[PDB]
Amino acid sequence: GVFYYKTGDMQTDDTNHVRWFLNINNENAYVDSDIRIEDDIQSGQTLDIDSFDITVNGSESYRGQEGINQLAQRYGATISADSASGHISVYIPQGYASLNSFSIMYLTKVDNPDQKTFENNSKAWYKENGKDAVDGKEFNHSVANVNAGGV
């Protein structure tokens, strides 16, 4: 389960946002297919479309809406987001997915400050070289609201 996962966190210095990370091809594997991630941000928070920050191979950073356009040019990797619905689609073509790790960070704005946890759900489609295809397996994550303690 290393190929793809999502995580997130809320920092004490920014309790009005949740930071989410879609971490794709984390072991820099060869891929036998395109990669598709379908992400649905759960209620109580709103995607900040300007907050996207994509790191490739832990070094190259692509920031904001222009960064998304540059990432599309360099890696054919498209990020489509709809703040209204909380839906994010990521597509990375096979040729650019291979050997490259992608960490897609975005922020959501907390809409319900008293809400106990913030959730982000995703599903992934990919085929790593020498491994069975993963066909829409779920990768979800919950972040505890640091405003609403010790867990």
CSV table of C-alpha atoms in Angstrom, one decimal, residues 94-146:
chain,number,residue,atom,x,y,z
A,94,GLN,CA,1.9,6.4,-17.8
A,95,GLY,CA,5.0,7.9,-19.5
A,96,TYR,CA,5.3,10.6,-16.9
A,97,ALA,CA,4.1,8.6,-13.9
A,98,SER,CA,7.0,6.1,-14.2
A,99,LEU,CA,9.8,6.8,-11.8
A,100,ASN,CA,8.3,10.1,-10.5
A,101,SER,CA,6.7,10.7,-7.2
A,102,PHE,CA,4.0,13.4,-6.9
A,103,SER,CA,2.9,15.0,-3.7
A,104,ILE,CA,-0.1,17.1,-4.2
A,105,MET,CA,-0.8,19.4,-1.3
A,106,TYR,CA,-3.9,21.6,-1.0
A,107,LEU,CA,-5.6,23.4,1.7
A,108,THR,CA,-9.2,23.4,2.7
A,109,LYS,CA,-10.8,26.3,4.6
A,110,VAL,CA,-12.6,25.2,7.7
A,111,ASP,CA,-16.3,26.2,7.4
A,112,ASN,CA,-17.5,24.6,10.6
A,113,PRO,CA,-15.0,25.6,13.3
A,114,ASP,CA,-16.7,23.3,15.9
A,115,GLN,CA,-16.6,20.2,13.7
A,116,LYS,CA,-14.7,17.4,15.3
A,117,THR,CA,-12.9,15.9,12.3
A,118,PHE,CA,-12.4,16.8,8.7
A,119,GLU,CA,-12.4,14.0,6.1
A,120,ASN,CA,-11.0,13.6,2.7
A,121,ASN,CA,-11.8,10.6,0.5
A,122,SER,CA,-10.1,9.3,-2.5
A,123,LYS,CA,-10.0,6.4,-4.9
A,124,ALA,CA,-7.1,5.4,-7.1
A,125,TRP,CA,-6.6,3.6,-10.4
A,126,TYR,CA,-3.1,2.5,-11.3
A,127,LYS,CA,-1.0,-0.4,-12.3
A,128,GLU,CA,2.5,-0.6,-10.9
A,129,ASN,CA,5.0,-2.7,-12.9
A,130,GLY,CA,4.9,-6.3,-11.9
A,131,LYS,CA,1.8,-5.9,-9.7
A,132,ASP,CA,-2.0,-6.3,-10.2
A,133,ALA,CA,-3.9,-3.2,-11.1
A,134,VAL,CA,-5.6,-1.3,-8.4
A,135,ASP,CA,-9.1,-0.4,-9.6
A,136,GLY,CA,-10.7,2.4,-7.6
A,137,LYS,CA,-9.4,1.3,-4.1
A,138,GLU,CA,-10.3,3.8,-1.4
A,139,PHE,CA,-7.7,5.9,0.4
A,140,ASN,CA,-9.4,8.1,2.9
A,141,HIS,CA,-8.1,10.2,5.7
A,142,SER,CA,-9.5,12.1,8.7
A,143,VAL,CA,-7.9,15.0,10.4
A,144,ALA,CA,-8.9,15.9,14.0
A,145,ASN,CA,-9.9,19.5,14.6
A,146,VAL,CA,-7.3,20.9,16.9
